[PDB]
Structure 1
């Protein structure tokens, strides 16, 4: 039988052109007033997954 994708991971990562994955930053859901604007601005755009935790992502979603 075929491999099943870890769907939760499929809803948190997207495959870029090279091979790496874009993901949304943590710490931008609630408790925002105490955080500085500079943080919240820097956390807004998407970000690339680090080379340490890339193998864990590549395993859990083998399709795309």
Structure 2
């Protein structure tokens, strides 16, 4: 039967123009006041999935 998607992965990843995946950075969720503003700013924008974990993401998201 149809392959099922890993719904968590679906929530966390979105495919881009060539077939990458952007994702939201970790560590910008709670205790923030100790984190430096520069660090927070850098974490804020989205980020492409690296070469190492691309395969795993692909496995997770067969219909992405």
TM-score bracket for the superposition, by shorter chain length? over 0.9
Q: Cα deviation per residue 1:27-50 (whole Å; 9 max; x = unaligned)?
A: 000010000000000000000000
1:62 offset after TM fit, Å?
0.5
Judging by fraction of residues, say which structure has more helix: 2
1:24 offset after TM fit, Å?
0.1
Whole-angstrom distance in 2 between the partners of 1:38 and 1:47: 16
TM-score by length of 1: 0.98
Structure 1 unaligned spans of 5+: none
Structure 2 unaligned spans of 5+: none
Task: Show structure 1 runs of 4+ deviating over 3 A.
Answer: none
Q: CA RMSD in A?
A: 0.4
Q: Cα deviation per residue 1:5-46 (whole Å; 9 max; x = unaligned)?
A: 000000000000001000000000001000000000000000
TM-score by length of 2: 0.98
| Count of equivalent residues | 64
Which residue of structure 2 lines up, in the alignment, with residue 39 of structure 1? 39
